[PDB]
């Protein structure tokens, strides 16, 4: 039934096309063997071409299909890349449709969840300026997806982190530390912690962007998930050299971390101890 | 609005029930305040009853709604446990339907992402034998979810980590260190590093299970994400007593650790330096 579904992706009937896309994403959602069967049946050139469709209903199903395929192994992500999905995904970051924007962002984050080569392919496709620009969106769901995409890219090597910094992610992320939306706040904190997980120059860039006052302030958050993300970001910063460690101490982190060693939450006490250990 | 949908979760009409479930999942995915409003409206007893449903679609949706409620604060996760979700969830770990099994594992990993009280509730409900059995699964998608759930349980205190060891998780985790699948290998390394974040007795159990030669070998990985995971597992083992530190040296880690201080990736350099400093 798989070669018939593939043939149905070349159908001009919009209902037949939408049905074939739904059925292929269903097979692609069931593991690496099933994804590979979809790849081997030749679904990818057709899926990639469908990303040029102006119809929202087709685009949503085609993007959902590609993100499920991109949820497999690094070789399966590479197959999506080799079929040329990335230039088409980067173009969809200009889409005025907020639902399409979310799907394209999710597809990109799945590709960026692969190895360092897969992340580099996302950078080389020019995704970073469009991702950073999306951090100005008033749409909370778009913000969350753009932030998750950036945190995946920033989970790569030192050059992948530097690319995120050079595209201007830091001033946008620091501004998002003022967000009243705790879900956006957690995503901004996670993205900063991934950037702060790099070398001394990367950590220094987080400091220079003015992240420390807001990070230390969030260590007092009544929301324990926010507290833990802020603490993780600061612990990564504390991994830096003496200049980075001194900046953390000047921002008032010592008094907060010492106080956190007695906190009710065992995970918080534990991470505060490791952070305080790095600083001294 | 909310009381109506809570009443609709008890409706005899399958469509009115499916729509109420989807609506409840959407509100529950919008942060802690919206989760609290769903709890206050009394959605949990009805959601818990739906875990006994013969309908595959209703089951997957109820598991997804519960995983969203369980993505909140520790007190909100405790509300899911107090409503009696755990015996029904643990039972669903024996499901032959991989779609249901994935959702049940995801719900459990969210509950196990809480404090020691919430993790202990998962252990006391008998989740560990079913999880350990799933480590032998030929389905890579299920194996990853099971490894993630196990790593969350192992993120707790020494009592919770010992329960993971007592369930015979270590021989299954050491066997997975030979996996050609990089995603499975990453998850197995993460589960091991959490177990190794415990006290000397928990670290010695990891050593005795024969993890060190595989961990030492993975320091030669060209995949930086695998390398980092292995470095963190070794660094946690090296945080033990002199007997645990001696085992790492005996396993031949010192040479490669010193060489990795000059690795291209500056974060690898720091992690190798930190590991080597703990040993010396």
């Amino acid at each position: 039934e798989l070669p018939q579904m593939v043939q149905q992706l070349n159908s001009p009937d919009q209902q037949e096309l939408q049905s074939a896309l739904r059925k292929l994403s269903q097979i692609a959602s069931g593991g690496n063997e099933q994804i590979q069967a979809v790849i081997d049946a030749g679904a990818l050139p057709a899926l990639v071409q469908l990303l040029s469709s102006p119809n929202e209903q087709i685009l949503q199903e085609a993007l959902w299909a590609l993100s499920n395929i991109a949820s497999g192994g690094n070789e399966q992500i590479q197959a999506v890349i080799d079929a040329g999905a990335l230039p088409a995904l980067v173009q969809l970051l200009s889409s005025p449709n907020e639902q399409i924007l979310q799907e394209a962002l999710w597809a990109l984050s799945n590709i960026a969840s692969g190895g360092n080569e897969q992340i580099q392919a996302v950078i080389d496709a020019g995704a970073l300026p469009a991702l950073v620009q999306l951090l100005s969106s008033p749409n909370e769901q778009i913000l969350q997806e753009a932030l998750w995409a950036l945190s995946n890219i920033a989970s790569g090597g030192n050059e992948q982190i530097q690319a995120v910094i050079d595209a201007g992610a830091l001033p946008a992320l620091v501004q998002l530390l003022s967000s009243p939306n705790e879900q956006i706040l957690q995503e901004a904190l996670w993205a900063l912690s991934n950037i702060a997980s790099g070398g001394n120059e990367q950590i220094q860039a987080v400091i220079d962007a003015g992240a420390l006052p807001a990070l230390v302030q969030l260590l007092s958050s009544p929301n324990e998930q926010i507290l833990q993300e802020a603490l993780w970001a600061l612990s990564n910063i504390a991994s830096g050299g003496n200049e980075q460690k001194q900046a953390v101490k000047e921002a008032g982190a010592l008094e907060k971390l010492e106080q956190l060693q007695s906190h009710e939450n065992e995970k918080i006490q534990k991470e505060a101890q490791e952070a305080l250990e790095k600083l001294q | 609005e909310l009381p109506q949908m809570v009443q609709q979760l008890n409706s005899p009409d399958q469509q009115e029930l499916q729509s109420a479930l989807r609506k409840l999942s959407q509100i529950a995915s919008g942060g802690n305040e919206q989760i609290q409003a769903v709890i206050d409206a009394g959605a949990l007893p009805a959601l818990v009853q739906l875990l006994s449903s013969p309908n595959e679609q209703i089951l997957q949706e109820a598991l997804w709604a519960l995983s969203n409620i369980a993505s909140g604060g520790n007190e909100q996760i405790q509300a899911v446990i107090d409503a009696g979700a755990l015996p029904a969830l643990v039972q669903l770990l024996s499901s032959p339907n991989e779609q249901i099994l994935q959702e049940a594992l995801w719900a459990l990993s969210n509950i196990a992402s809480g404090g020691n009280e919430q993790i202990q509730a998962v252990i006391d409900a008998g989740a560990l034998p079913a999880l350990v059995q799933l480590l032998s699964s030929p389905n890579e998608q299920i194996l990853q979810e099971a490894l993630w759930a196990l790593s969350n349980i192992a993120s707790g205190g020494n009592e919770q980590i010992q329960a993971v060891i007592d369930a015979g998780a270590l021989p299954a985790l050491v066997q997975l260190l030979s996996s050609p699948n990089e995603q499975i290998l990453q998850e197995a390394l993460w589960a091991l590093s959490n177990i190794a974040s415990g006290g000397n007795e928990q670290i010695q159990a990891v050593i005795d299970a024969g993890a060190l030669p595989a961990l030492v070998q993975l320091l030669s990985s060209p995949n930086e994400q695998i390398l980092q995971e292995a470095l963190w597992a070794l660094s946690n083992i090296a945080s033990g007593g002199n007997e645990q530190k001696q085992a790492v040296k005996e396993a031949g880690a010192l040479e490669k650790l010193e060489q990795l201080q000059s690795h291209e990736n500056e974060k690898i350099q720091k992690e190798a330096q930190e590991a080597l400093e703990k040993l010396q």
Partner: peptide, 10 residues
């Protein structure tokens, strides 16, 4: 149409 994200803090 279900989206799940997982994150690890050492």
């Amino acid at each position: 149409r279900r989206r799940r994200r997982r994150r690890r803090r050492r």
